[PDB]
Paper text:
Composed of a diverse array of proteins, the tegument is an amorphous aggregate sandwiched between herpesviruses’ icosahedral capsid and outer envelope. These include in HCMV the CVSC proteins pUL77 [pUL25 in herpes simplex virus 1 (HSV-1)] and pUL48 (HSV-1 pUL36; also called large tegument protein), as well as pUL48’s non–CVSC-binding partner, pUL47 (HSV-1 pUL37; also called inner tegument protein). We resolve atomic structures of portal vertex-associated tegument (PVAT) and identify multiple configurations of PVAT arising from layered reorganization of pUL77, pUL48 (large tegument protein), and pUL47 (inner tegument protein) assemblies.
Similar to VC1, VC2 has a pentameric portal cap composed of five copies of pUL77-u that harbor the genome terminus. This indicates that VC2 portal vertices do retain a full complement of pUL77 and pUL48 and that although certain head elements may not be orderly bound, these are nonetheless flexibly linked in the vicinity of the portal vertex. However, whereas VC2 decamer lacks extensive contact with its underlying capsid (VC2 decamer is spatially localized only by portal cap binding of the genome terminus and flexible linker–CBDs anchored to the capsid), the inverted nature of NC2-inv’s decamer allows each pUL48-l copy to wedge within a valley-like topology between each asymmetric unit’s P hexon tower and adjacent CVSC helix bundle. One plausible explanation for their absence could be that filaments in VC2/NC2 exist in an “extended” state [similar to that observed in detergent-treated HSV-1 capsids mentioned previously], as opposed to a “retracted” or “capsid-draped” state as in VC1/NC1.
Residue numbers in the entry:
A (entry chain H), B (entry chain L): 1 to 49
C (entry chain Z): 89 to 175
D (entry chain Y): 3 to 115, 122 to 245, 259 to 306
E (entry chain X): 1 to 241, 253 to 306
F (entry chain W): 1 to 290
G (entry chain I): 1078 to 1370
H (entry chain I): 50 to 392
I (entry chain J): 197 to 245
The structure:
Amino acid sequence: MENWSALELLPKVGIPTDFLTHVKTSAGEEMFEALRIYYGDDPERYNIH
Amino acid sequence: MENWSALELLPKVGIPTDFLTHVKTSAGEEMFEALRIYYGDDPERYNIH
Amino acid sequence: RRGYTYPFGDRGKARDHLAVLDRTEFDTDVRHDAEIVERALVSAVILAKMSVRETLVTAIGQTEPIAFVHLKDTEVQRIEENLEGVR
Amino acid sequence: AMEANIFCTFDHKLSIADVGKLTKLVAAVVPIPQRLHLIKHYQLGLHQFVDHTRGYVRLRGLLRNMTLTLMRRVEGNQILLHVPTHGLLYTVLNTGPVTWEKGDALCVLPPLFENLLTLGQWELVLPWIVPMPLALEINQRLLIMGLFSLDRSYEEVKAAVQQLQTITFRDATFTIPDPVIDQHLLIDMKTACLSMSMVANLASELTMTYVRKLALEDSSMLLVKCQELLMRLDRERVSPDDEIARLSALFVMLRQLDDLIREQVVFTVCDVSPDNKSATCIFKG
Amino acid sequence: MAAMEANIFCTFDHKLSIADVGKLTKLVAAVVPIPQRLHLIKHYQLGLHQFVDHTRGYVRLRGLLRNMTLTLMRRVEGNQILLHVPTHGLLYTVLNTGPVTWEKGDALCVLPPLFHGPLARENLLTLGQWELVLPWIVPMPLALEINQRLLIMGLFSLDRSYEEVKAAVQQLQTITFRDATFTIPDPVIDQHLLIDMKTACLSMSMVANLASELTMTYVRKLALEDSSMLLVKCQELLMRLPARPQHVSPDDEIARLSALFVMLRQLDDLIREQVVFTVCDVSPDNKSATCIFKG
Amino acid sequence: MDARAVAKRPRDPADEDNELVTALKAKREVNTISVRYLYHADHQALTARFFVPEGLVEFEAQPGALLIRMETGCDSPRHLYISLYLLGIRASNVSASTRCLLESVYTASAARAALQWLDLGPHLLHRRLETLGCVKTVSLGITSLLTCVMRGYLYNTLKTEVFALMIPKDMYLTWEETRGRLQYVYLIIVYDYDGPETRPGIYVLTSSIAHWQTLVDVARGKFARERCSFVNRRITRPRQIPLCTGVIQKLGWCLADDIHTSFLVHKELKLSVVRLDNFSVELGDFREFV
Amino acid sequence: TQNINTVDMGLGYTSNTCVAYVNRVRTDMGVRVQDLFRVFPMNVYRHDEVDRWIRHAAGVERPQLLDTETISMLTFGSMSERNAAATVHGQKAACELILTPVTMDVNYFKIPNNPRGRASCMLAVDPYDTEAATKAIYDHREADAQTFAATHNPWASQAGCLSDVLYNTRHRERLGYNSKFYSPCAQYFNTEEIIAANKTLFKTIDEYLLRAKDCIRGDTDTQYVCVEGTEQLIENPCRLTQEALPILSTTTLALMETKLKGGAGAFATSETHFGNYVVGEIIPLQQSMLFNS
Amino acid sequence: FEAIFGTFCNRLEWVYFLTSGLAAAAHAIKFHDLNKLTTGKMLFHVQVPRVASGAGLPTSRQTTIMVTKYSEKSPITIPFELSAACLTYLRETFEGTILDKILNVEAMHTVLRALKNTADAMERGLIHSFLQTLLRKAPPYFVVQTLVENATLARQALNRIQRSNILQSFKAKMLATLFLLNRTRDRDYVLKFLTRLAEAATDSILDNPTTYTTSSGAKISGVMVSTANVMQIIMSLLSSHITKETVSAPATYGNFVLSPENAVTAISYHSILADFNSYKAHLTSGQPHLPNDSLSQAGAHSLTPLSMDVIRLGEKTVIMENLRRVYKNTDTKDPLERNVDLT
Amino acid sequence: VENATLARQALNRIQRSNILQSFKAKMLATLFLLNRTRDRDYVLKFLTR
């Protein structure tokens, strides 16, 4: 549980991303706590309250 | 649940306060939606985290 | 049973007379049964006269007579002679 | 931006009263035989299909063929008709004998009974828009009245028909016309009744032979019960080419029933007002 | 996930010739079925050829074609094809391919192709033992006749000799419709027809059990006081054998008629094909029509 | 009528200024109402609003409930708009624990009266229920208002979020090991002819089968016991004519990957549901099968 | 559409209101009793002849409902009394009768009092103490807060007495009552609403401003309760104080005549002859206030 | 022949919320991001005074009481319908004949009329919604006067006996003053009753000394609003105290705007602190008191003069108004014309 | 005048019964004005009304 919409909206610093294994394998095999996946274009970031 | 400690730390606007009845009477007879009453000096406002 | 399926034009009076025809039961006492039989026959004769679209007594204080509906003359005569023999 | 309307013209000259009479029908359901861009006034409505030997069955079958259009605009020398497209929302005038309510499924029926517009030997007879249950009940009433048509010498049968004839719906009662006029039944209703009776009669004799053989095999143990029921109805009371002929006859009679057995939904309702004369509906093809 | 595609591009995984692209261009506006909607598909999944099989049943082919997806053909490019899956209720331009005449205002159905006359035409796409067999778009009366005759063949097959069924299948095969004769290929009694036979028997039996004495006796009573070619013909098809009706109740009669309507819908759905297009135009050469899609 | 006008691309309806903007610009008037953008102007969903008492709107306050119109026997409140949840108290396939949960939620005169009006008449359910769309908006009140979708997607005013259709778990049916891409949603009511009173089952089925006869074949296979019950009642009980073993009507389409499981919380009670994440409403009429 | 948000800038009540003027009575101020046969339409006597005879004597018609579905509809709520041909005295204010022992204290009626015979104002009870609220309302081994007797009407102040089952809405709906008909006794006898209204002082007055109000149809002859949102909610001070006001009544035409002969303020006094009495009104409504303007 | 003399139209007079005298009770603010926020809170911090005690007696602890007040929502809505005929004539032209131009102009004027009537209806709806909220928080005379009379004695939650006295006073003042103007027309009694109503209401925490002040004299302390009949009766009674005045009122709404810091905190925390920078500067400078409140800061800049009646009630100048013009010829009932029940 | 503000609609039964009551009351009250009163304030109010 994090503010994923804030991560989508707020500016970000670009880095080269070095996963040893595949990003979807790192995500699927639960390397990271607090994971959020979506496909296509999820419109909920446009919801501000 | 209100953040009373910020209310204590933040700057405030000094107003002439007018209750028809005693403050303790309008607090005790539930005029207000949210209340916090404490006696003495409550250290809660000092632990910023 | 036959009366409920019949297409009476005005079902209200039909169903009232069918209810009084439904309720009649003998209470195992000699004197009561003749009067309950008379009531049941009044209802049934009204219902039969309704079915054949014929007139019926509307005058207040009157009551439909206990009479055969559309039986032939010879059979009504034979039935009444038999009833007189029972008398 | 314009829309794809149909143009209609009247050969007859119109009075101001006629034009004002048309402007009241600016949301009606006017059916047209064929998808045409410029038509004459004769092709509007059911008046072209009226005949004195055919009845409700023939006109229902003819209505199912037509193209349904809503009147859109009325002016001098022109009437503009809109042909609606499936899945879009439209305003339609209530012209039947019954009140609509939200969520209804409406279907188009031949009419069973200021006024409507006549010019010469001409008349604008618009179809009836009723909810689907009322149409189904009306069709069944008409079919049963047709089957009773040969016992009409007795008062019991006539009382039965008078009970069939009156129908009650949402806060309205009306009497449908008897398919028997001048003591004899019209040829279209006669064919409908004859086809119904023939399919019943052919099924009664044909089905047992096949049910026996196929129930021997049937793993559903349903067809055995079917054969048992057939044995019961039997108890209450062929050359191969002739078997083919009777099977063909059964299926052709069923195809004859197809016009009456099922009716299409053409709208579904969502609007309420004291103005109840109209509602907004989505169109269905 | 991915929303369903509407415009579908098809590529031929085979060296096409000039004549192949020509007879492929002639098929613009034709309706072709596909098993899987995808933006780019391969030509193997085009038409009915993938389903033709040693089973050889026509009823199997009909059942497979029913569950397929219908799409219309759009313009042809060198070795590429565009297909468009239509929407309900819109207006479309449709080409006919079978030698069956259409009329302005009739309903159309999809059925596996028959064979006509000498069966002289097989110059469609062939590409290394693959073919573009398209389904036939036929008007409703012929479709009803085809389904009805298949069901009649199946029903008659039960408890008739092998040669008797042979003769019956021979005569029921041949259909004449709008002054042209068509023949059903491979009428074969598999299990797919066996299900239809089972439901036909159940539906007929329930019709017979539901039909009232009024319904049964109408035909007999009409025959006693009316005479016509219709009546004499239909009574010649029937078995051979005033007074008041002994039971009269409109409410029972209407309840019974409603149930009988449900059963008659059950039986009709065996021969009744689903309408895919409704026609309102014909090119005077009868090569194409403008139709409303109904799916 | 010239080649330049034929070859001219159509105007964009979004680039054109509205009727209100054109009028205010024509007289160069100004209004406090803001008319530059019109909400719901580009919504392709057809919607209607239904007024319903407070007693029925439990489990419907969250967008995604299927709205069904039931006809009472009487004249004054001729129809009630009930959801698939309240209808689940009548269903036979719903487990007794779920039924107790639902009965604990719907404890108002309106809901119990709905159930009584259902069980009171002789007709079957489907000859008594008309299916409206699915719901997405609620304003609360003693007489509450629900906006319902007749044909479209379920989404916000700005389509900034798109709603799913919620199916109570015991009512959900699936009949293939692997689903195809696109699958159609059906509502099935199947009648069991056990003993004195016909017992209905209420199901919502998602299958890729669109052709009517194939669907009715697989349904006759899946509900063979109900068919046997129908014929066995017909043989054992004459003169009480039954119609239909079941009815199917189609009420939408969805994608196979948009089916997920979820729970709905109300009165601190959890009702587990199956959700159709970008449901599109497309209603048919009831088709009865035997 | 426009969104408006309001936020209150006072730490007390920054606004006051008063009932400044009155300029007609909407009701007749009559003496026409409630017709229970409309309120409880399902009840019949078990014997046809006793039922028909009593209905004839009382002037009531046979219970006319298409029984099953229309009864469920009525128990959901129904407006089943036709209007009279003409009205000259406005809306019919029907009287609800509480049976009372013939030896009830006549001084009870001379001051504003709870008509059920035992006081039930929750402002006198500690907030949220339902045990003490229930004891104050019903426990007849405890002295009534107003008069310190157990009761003045045993048939009205107890749990499940005749008027408790008649006028308490929870008992009325175990009976088959028609909800649409307004009932004057309901505010005093809906003891569960009374228990729930037992809050603190400011919560009580806020609730009085919001929810403790009546709703009566303005256009019908009879007093039908209206749903929220169709017309204005009606203030009733008797819902807070939980008392009924004594109106000028008498047992003899002589004392009424001497009231009419009397000077101003005669209506406000309550003399008595031996067995015949007058109760004077506690506010000078009828005499001066209604007819001054 | 038949003669048609003049044809006439409704030359309606408009109402604007800020021109109303009721607007005195409001501090009206315009906020463009209102569709996005759903909560508004104002936090109060108050430490009571206390008195030194004698020997052997308990002493009073210092106690801080904090309260929060939350905003309430109440949107308003009104529709207007345009027919297909006006929509097509508004946009399509046919050879430009003078009849076609007539229809085009008529469609344009129909659109304009609909927009004008709708905007006026929105002004009236704002007046109506404000009056309803203001009513729902306003207790009657007997409640507030009982509170003001019993104010001094209670020093905590009410005793059993203290609230018995509260109830007794409720009943006495309920009967005594039920329909004021019918019971008496005595000039002094009515003057003192209105002064009691004016002095009973507590002060608002927003002080805005430049708004609603009369040409010469002094600040207006409140508004007194009633039906036209009641105000005509009162003005006939107390003309000795009532005078016609010209009052300076804010010409337009005050605009509240989100700052960039506010945008950051709204994106990240779903929370906005009004006037973030004033807080941060006062927080790092070590200043315990802000000078002004964000609602006050957002107030309007311009004043316009408008003429209205005022009455003097014990060194309080309040406004007298009737809202008959808002509700005249409309389909909605005046909230101040009411029904009261007595049993 | 007194009843004007109470209905923007066709009068219902109660409203017109109130109208009737007012008719009768005022008819009895003001039938021979100058013979009943000579009060300067009352006649000025009457003429103003």
